[PDB]
């Protein structure tokens, strides 16, 4: 929430100066899986975790 680049004798950059440059990033995939308790491993009376 602060532009650190200070230039003397000049008014400062505003309060929330930063915008996320999308061209220059490093991005990697990600997958949100759902795992379930093994049906054999589940006890008799119980819903799977």
């Amino acid at each position: 929430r602060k532009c650190n680049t200070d230039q003397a004798g000049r008014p400062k950059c505003p309060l929330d100066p930063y915008f996320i440059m999308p061209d220059k990033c490093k991005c990697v995939d990600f997958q949100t899986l759902k795992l379930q308790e093994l049906p054999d491993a589940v006890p008799h009376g119980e819903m799977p975790r």
């Binding site: 915008f19 440059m21 999308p22 061209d23």
Partner: protein, 596 residues
């Protein structure tokens, strides 16, 4: 700030201008730039294979870095077309490039497209699923001050996948001294804007998997290039969209594909024309004309033995008649429809699949594969804007083409009642509460059906062997019977041919030009067809033990006219002569009379 020196940009524009020059080396891109100039187009298309052939390192830079190299490319094109022409380059303000060819590792599907290809030029297969309403995005907005009588013009830029601050995208509403403005819409500039949603092609996805989809963005001269259900292949830049002003970011960067080119399936290949093609087809037209149709039908589907008359009829449907439209608004259709029917193992589905492989705009369907709403059009609800919407069925997609129905007898009767529209009119009058429509579905129908009782009963009349009514058989212009004649020489030749085949392009060229051709019929043929149909419309035409197959009608006369015109299209004569009329007479006679 303004850049004064840039080794990368300067060498990029130099290399591009060198490549796009091409006049000294075979004039490929000289011809292409002259073509887009004459045709008044400004989105060049560039073979990346040729780019690799000339300057391979430049190609790798282009692929592995998209936006910079593409900006350099489009500006080099601007300078190049500026050299070749002045007023044209002044008129059009920015000259786009699109990419094409082979994209080895980057030719992917929406499944294999990972984040590894971010900011790079991908070539994505797969169908279309969404098509947004096309909208103009303002790019140069002119305003007029009523009080001051001065005109200003704010500008904008394609900040689609780059950093964007509010200053760029402000739009004026007040003058510097609080004197409200009036925008000049006409003097402004605009860029249409559409967004489609490609999905992995339904067959190519691994089975039992929810499919993967990728969004695509489209702009000027690319918006109405692909409707839903198009087997598109989009070449474009895969990038990230910035989630607007944050203060907290999850780091989850949504992605799009800014399309730099859009293509359909290559089969609709009407432009494939060249000197060799015209030379050979002119030879075929001129050196022989009395046996064009016979030779062509003989070589039509070489794999299946015999079926001489039926294959001739297949060719009649393929070429088509001539659509005769009237000044009054009446329209007499020009397209033949055919119903194969025969014993099992008489290659009915193989003729169908032959048409599906060869003809342009050929749509498969199987008996209960499509039920009504699939075959004809359907009316759904948008569910976002509330309005209705039309979903084009197989027939509508097949307009000016062919639909091949397999297991036509086992198709439900409701579907046939639905296609009662199309089988003569070529139009579907779909309608629900909020939308009435009349959709051009003008396309031939080839069909395959097995007879009732599983196999054709040789000792019963065709009306009893067919589980279809006089109405339906009349809607079909042609009905054909095929029976496995178990004669010794027949079995010898069919099995020999089958084993022989167990051990074309000129036709594709010929079919669509012949379809373009529009002959007209002679008075000799006119009298001949009138008296021949009069001969047919009589009990004396038939005899005991030779029952008719379909209820003979003015439809029978009309489809004889279509057959004669189709044979004229085959002959390229532009004159439906007595030869064509006689041949159609023979065809309709054999198709309509069968023994008992």
């Amino acid at each position: 700030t303004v850049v004064l020196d840039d080794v990368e940009l300067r060498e990029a524009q130099r290399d591009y201008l060198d490549f796009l020059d091409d006049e000294e080396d075979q004039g490929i891109y000289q011809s292409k730039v002259r073509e887009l100039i004459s045709d008044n187009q400004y989105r060049l298309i560039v073979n990346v294979n040729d780019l690799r052939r000339k300057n391979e390192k430049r190609a790798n830079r282009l692929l592995n870095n998209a936006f910079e190299e593409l900006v350099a490319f489009q500006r080099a094109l601007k300078d190049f077309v500026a050299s070749i022409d002045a007023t044209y380059a002044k008129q059009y303000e920015e000259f786009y490039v699109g990419l094409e060819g082979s994209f080895g590792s980057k030719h992917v599907s929406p499944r294999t497209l990972t984040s590894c290809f971010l900011s790079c030029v991908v070539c994505v297969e797969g169908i279309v699923t969404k098509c947004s309403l096309v909208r103009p995005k303002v790019v140069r907005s002119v305003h007029y001050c009523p009080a001051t009588k001065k005109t200003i013009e704010r500008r904008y830029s394609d900040l689609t996948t780059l950093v964007a601050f509010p200053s760029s995208s402000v739009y004026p509403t007040k003058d510097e001294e609080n004197n409200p403005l009036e925008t000049e819409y006409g003097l402004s500039v605009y860029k249409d804007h559409q967004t489609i949603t490609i999905q992995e092609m339904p067959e190519k996805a691994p089975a039992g998997q929810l499919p993967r989809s990728v969004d695509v963005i489209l702009d000027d001269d690319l918006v109405d290039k692909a409707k839903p259900g198009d087997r598109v292949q989009v070449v474009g830049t895969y990038r990230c969209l910035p989630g607007k002003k944050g203060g907290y970011t999850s780091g989850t960067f949504r992605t799009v594909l800014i399309a730099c080119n859009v293509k359909q399936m290559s089969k609709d290949a009407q432009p494939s024309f060249s000197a060799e093609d015209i030379a050979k087809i002119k030879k075929f037209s001129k050196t022989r004309s009395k046996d064009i149709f016979d030779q062509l039908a003989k070589s039509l589907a070489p794999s299946i033995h015999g079926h001489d008359y039926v294959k001739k009829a297949i060719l009649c449907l393929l070429l088509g008649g001539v659509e005769r439209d009237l000044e009054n608004g009446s329209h007499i259709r020009g397209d033949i429809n055919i119903l194969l029917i025969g014993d099992p193992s008489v290659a009915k589905s193989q003729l169908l699949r032959y048409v599906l492989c060869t003809a342009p705009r050929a749509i498969p369907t199987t008996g209960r594969g499509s039920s009504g709403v699939g075959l004809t059009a359907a009316v759904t609800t948008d569910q976002e804007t509330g309005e209705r919407r039309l979903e084009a069925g197989a027939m509508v997609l097949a307009d000016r083409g062919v639909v091949c129905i397999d297991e036509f007898d086992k198709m439900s009767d409701m579907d046939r009642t639905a296609i009662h529209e199309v089988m003569e009119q070529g139009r579907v009058t779909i309608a629900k509460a909020g939308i009435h429509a009349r959709l051009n579905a003008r396309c031939s129908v080839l069909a395959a059906a097995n007879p009732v009782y599983g196999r054709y009963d040789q000792y019963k009349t065709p009306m009893e062997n067919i589980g279809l009514q006089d109405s339906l058989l009349s809607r079909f212009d042609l009905l054909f019977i095929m029976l496995d004649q178990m004669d010794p020489e027949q079995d010898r030749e069919i099995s020999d041919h089958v084993l022989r085949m167990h051990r074309a392009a000129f036709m594709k060229k010929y079919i669509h030009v012949a379809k373009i051709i529009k002959p007209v019929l002679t008075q000799e043929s006119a009298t001949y067809i009138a008296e021949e149909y009069s001969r047919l419309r009589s009990q004396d035409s038939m005899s005991s033990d030779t029952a008719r197959t379909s209820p003979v009608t003015a439809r029978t006369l009309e489809t004889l006219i279509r057959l004669a015109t189709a044979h004229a299209k085959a002959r390229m004569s532009k004159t439906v002569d007595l030869q064509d009329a006689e041949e159609a007479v023979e065809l309709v006679q054999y198709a309509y009379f069968k023994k008992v």
